[PDB]
Write a protein that binds this DNA or RNA. Structure first.
Lengths: 189, 190, 190, 196
DNA sequence: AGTGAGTACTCACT
DNA sequence: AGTGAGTACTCACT
């Protein structure tokens, strides 16, 4: 109800040019058009607010990923879509990206970053499962170690999101993706 | 100065420790330095300037070593490798300073600092871009991909490795497994 | 409300006390009110704003009663008399606020405030310059002096009295001996 | 030499301290650091000429006192006429003030707001002395010219001094715009009119 | 509305 | 160069 009102606002702010700095509960209570006192009648703490966004993020990405695995059988085609998914989500959610990159959580309690870490651990496991299965599905595996291959993929992704935030959202992740994919693909050897 | 350097040295140390995940208050800083909060403003006008010094130290150290690699290596691919390895290596032996490079430690300071960091990254990219453009003259053949698209591709990998380095509280060493990683980057040199 | 005015009142009281000769830090002001400093910013953005309210109060209380004097009384010499008494009276009644009229209490605050106090005096001298010129308008005679010089001369007096009032730690009350002083002023209305 | 050299600097500081007090930055704390800059030494270097900052204003106030007092005793000699003496003494107050805008911020008590209260007390004694002196002039009028004054001698001095203090206050408020000694010849006639 | 501990920065004497 | 005590103002939770 109002709980979503807040979150939706916390993000919009997290996306604005003011998201690059502490988002006080007061300045937040204003965006919502209520009082700080109200805020705490929906959330036990500011931390819980971020925890809910992290949960949303995790849900959107994990769900989308599992669907990708059902709609596509090709090992490579799978990765291509999974990478585009991350880049796409990030681009479509600048504010939530500041959470993915960890920047926004700098003002919050550390435990929240551990959460984003697990999210990533979860995304890596998937990427790893996909390549691990190329063997059964295509007969031949990979030259490079599977684990190392997924980190290389993930690394490119975090890096693209990191830059996206640096430039203040001027450097769009999905830009020239069609031309970039051939480069990442040339790594799956 | 001795004290000026002594402060900056503690700044980075604090950025490397657990305290790096939070704001570096002039209080705690002076605590670690072993002086009075006022002593700080004796060698530095503002806390912001302290970060500016660190940024310059990063700028210089990186640009300097990059230019040395360019003068000591004529191979386009070997140049690219050493440059990428230098970015990573620096990051690993300067956990505190890396937290700046990634932009995390700059969240509590003046936005201008980030712009400074963006200029560095643009400067580093230009170097990668010049190195790629020269392969045509030097080795004759050019690159399938787009020179500009290739630098951003290499850069992305590097910013990605430093990002995770910070997330894991410095457990994921950037240079670990680099030799087995490089061949993957070499492949993108289409 | 119950707290905004409550703060302002404690602010003037400190301006009236011996502390009034020393900057009124938010730390002390908070103590005097019996709350935490933060609480102060719950009803006031900046300490400067607290002085603004106090200045507006002075501006209103004065400009108001002055006009009423011009509306009710119509005798020139009687008008000037009452205007002077009002200035002194208000001063004596508001020791702390007088410390602002003189500009002392504003030495630690924004330079803008002094301007707000300077304009008030300008407005006051204005009213005076008006009554002095209307002399020929009603009595058909003119002062053997410059109307502008006359008001300034009268104002000068008043400012001097409030000035001494402050210096003396509020021992030299402004209104004391007024009834025997006025003749000295009237004598100037040649 | 050595002593006259330290006094050349001890007084060199003051020359700067007042200079700053005269400037537009006079309406705000004149910290030691900034002061040492006006001249070219360090904090510790400043303290080898003065025990503290207070002691700096004292010497400045002392200078103030000497100027007015001395210049006043001389006024009493080179002039016997009561009214003529009052016209001068007043002109001296308004003059010394306009001639040293930085020091006036000290007379008006403004610049002192930053310093220790005991310093304002010293200025309070100065005014009292100038008033007692003014009171003397008014009293002697009788012996000198036969008659005295209608109003009380004390009330008359305060009335005149109030005008002065008031003139110096505007001079500071307008940021040294409203010059005191402006139209003195025109104003005085208004002041004498009170000498009844 | 109210606050505990904080937040980068300052000053006169050292 | 070094600091004890400031300074005006802030914040997430009350």
């Amino acid at each position: 109800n109002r709980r979503e009102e807040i979150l939706q606002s916390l993000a919009l702010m997290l996306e604005s040019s003011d998201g690059s700095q502490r988002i006080t509960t007061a300045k937040l209570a204003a965006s919502v058009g209520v009082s700080e006192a109200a805020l705490y009648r929906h959330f036990p703490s500011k931390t819980r607010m971020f925890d809910s966004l992290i949960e949303f993020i995790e849900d959107s990405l994990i769900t989308r990923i599992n669907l990708i695995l059902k709609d596509e059988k090709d090992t490579t085609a799978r990765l291509r879509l999974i990478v585009l998914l991350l880049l796409g989500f990030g681009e479509r959610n600048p504010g939530l990206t500041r959470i993915l990159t960890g920047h926004a959580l700098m003002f919050e309690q550390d435990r929240l970053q551990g959460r984003i870490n697990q999210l990533f651990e979860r995304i890596e496991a998937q990427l790893r499962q996909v390549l691990r299965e190329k063997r059964m599905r295509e007969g031949e595996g990979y030259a490079t170690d599977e684990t190392l291959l997924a980190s290389q993929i993930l690394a490119f992704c975090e890096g693209m999101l990191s830059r996206f935030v640096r430039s203040e959202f001027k450097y769009r992740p999905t830009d020239d993706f069609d031309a970039r994919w051939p480069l990442i693909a040339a790594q799956l050897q």
